Amino acid sequence: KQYIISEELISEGKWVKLEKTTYMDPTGKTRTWESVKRTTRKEQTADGVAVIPVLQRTLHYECIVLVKQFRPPMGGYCIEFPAGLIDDGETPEAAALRELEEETGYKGDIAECSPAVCMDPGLSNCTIHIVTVTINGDDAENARPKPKPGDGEFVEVISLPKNDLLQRLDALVAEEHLTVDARVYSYALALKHA
Amino acid sequence: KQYIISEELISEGKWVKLEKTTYMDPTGKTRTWESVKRTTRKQTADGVAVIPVLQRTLHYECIVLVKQFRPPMGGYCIEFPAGLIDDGETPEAAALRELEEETGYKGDIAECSPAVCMDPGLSNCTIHIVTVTINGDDAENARPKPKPGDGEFVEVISLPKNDLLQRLDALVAEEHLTVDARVYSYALALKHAN
Ligand SMILES: [Cl-]
Ligand SMILES: [Mg+2]
Ligand SMILES: [Mg+2]
Ligand SMILES: [Mg+2]
Ligand SMILES: [Mg+2]
Numbered sequence: 001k002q003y004i005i006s007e008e009l010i011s012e013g014k015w016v017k018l019e020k021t022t023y024m025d026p027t028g029k030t031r032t033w034e035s036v037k038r039t040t041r042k043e044q045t046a047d048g049v050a051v052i053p054v055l056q057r058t059l060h061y062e063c064i065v066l067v068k069q070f071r072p073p074m075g076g077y078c079i080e081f082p083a084g085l086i087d088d089g090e091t092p093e094a095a096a097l098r099e100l101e102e103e104t105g106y107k108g109d110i111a112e113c114s115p116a117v118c119m120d121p122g123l124s125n126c127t128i129h130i131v132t133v134t135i136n137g138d139d140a141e142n143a144r145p146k147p148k149p150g151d152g153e154f155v156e157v158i159s160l161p162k163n164d165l166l167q168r169l170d171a172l173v174a175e176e177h178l179t180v181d182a183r184v185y186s187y188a189l190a191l192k193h194a
Numbered sequence: 195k196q197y198i199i200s201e202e203l204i205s206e207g208k209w210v211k212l213e214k215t216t217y218m219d220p221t222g223k224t225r226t227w228e229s230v231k232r233t234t235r236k237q238t239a240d241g242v243a244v245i246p247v248l249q250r251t252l253h254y255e256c257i258v259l260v261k262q263f264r265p266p267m268g269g270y271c272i273e274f275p276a277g278l279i280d281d282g283e284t285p286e287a288a289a290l291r292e293l294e295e296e297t298g299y300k301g302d303i304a305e306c307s308p309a310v311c312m313d314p315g316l317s318n319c320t321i322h323i324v325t326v327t328i329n330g331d332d333a334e335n336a337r338p339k340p341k342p343g344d345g346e347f348v349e350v351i352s353l354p355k356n357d358l359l360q361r362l363d364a365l366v367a368e369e370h371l372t373v374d375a376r377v378y379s380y381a382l383a384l385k386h387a388n
Contacts, residue, residue: 016230016316018205018212020207033265072217072229073316078311083315115363117373117375117378118264124317125268132382170308173308181310183376183379184379186245190384193384
């Protein structure tokens with residue numbers, strides 16, 4: 001029923017643009033919307049990937065590996081799933097494993113990969129694949145993992161037990177002035193609601 | 195260690211602005227970032243998203259979701275009921291109001307998150323995620339009628355909690371819709387909790 005009529009540029013940057021979107025509502029009335037888009041998207045299925053990294057070790061509870069970084073748009077520190085943009089020609093799966101190794105040092109194995117999902121659809125067209133990855137923490141390659149961050153990336157790794165994720169995240173927030181990512185919190189809520 | 199040095203406006207709109215953020219990295223090097231902000235914040239957060247658990251005796255619990263055309267995405271999206279918090283409104287009151295508006299259901303607050311980030315590599319947008327139970331056997335929830343505001347066109351989709359991820363994957367396979375990343379994260383964790 002509803003569809004895009006046109007997209008007028010309002011302002012471009014090196015990395016992000018703002019657009020005035022004209023669209024047809026279900027009554028036949030024309031309406032407008034201010035939309036944000038990244039400038040970097042190619043023939044990728046999505047802008048980025050987020051990795052759900054499940055650290056598995058014998059005689060240990062499973063952990064979910066997360067990353068803490070300063071995020072300039074937020075003006076503060078955020079706790080997130082390891083994540084980044086998909087390179088031109090890279091598969092979501094390869095980007096997931098690469099970004100996980102870069103940001104955390106862990107070498108994972110693909111478990112599953114989502115279709116493209118929207119980050120904030122009332123505001124942007126940004127999409128990711130959410131890729132679930134198991135990390136064999138008993139393999140020697142994952143013994144003392146060293147991050148290989150790229151230029152301008154500064155990451156601290158935080159691994160929290162899956163069986164208590166939400167309480168552990170609430171404790172971090174109580175002690176240390178930082179924001180939890182909405183996908184991380186949604187995941188933690190569902191672990192409790194199950 | 196890291197902090198904001200300055201924020202240059204690049205373009206404002208009625209609802210969204212684009213900013214060049216200058217910040218200090220942990221090595222003492224000055225760097226820049228293109229950031230998006232909403233112009234509407236007054237509030238603990240921009241918005242709320244509601245996790246509505248429809249509970250009816252002798253039925254599977256359902257998660258109530260909404261399908262809407264999203265102009266930034268150029269297509270239809272499946273999301274938790276959600277909207278912006280009004281000036282002076284508590285997150286909890288906004289959650290119950292937006293849930294009744296978008297779905298017709300009258301719920302009860304179960305829990306409320308701290309402010310969580312939507313896409314911290316890109317914007318400063320935040321929400322409270324509010325978990326709400328809906329007593330589907332109460333007569334008030336028998337024949338619920340949405341009361342959408344101006345420009346809101348919502349289809350309500352209830353899916354069983356015990357099979358949410360498979361049900362969402364099936365919708366995506368049959369219908370060309372995008373699932374919201376928080377919805378998908380929640381659905382994954384329902385499966386991963388085993
Ligand atoms: Cl619940
Ligand atoms: Mg990253
Ligand atoms: Mg990275
Ligand atoms: Mg609304
Ligand atoms: Mg809404």
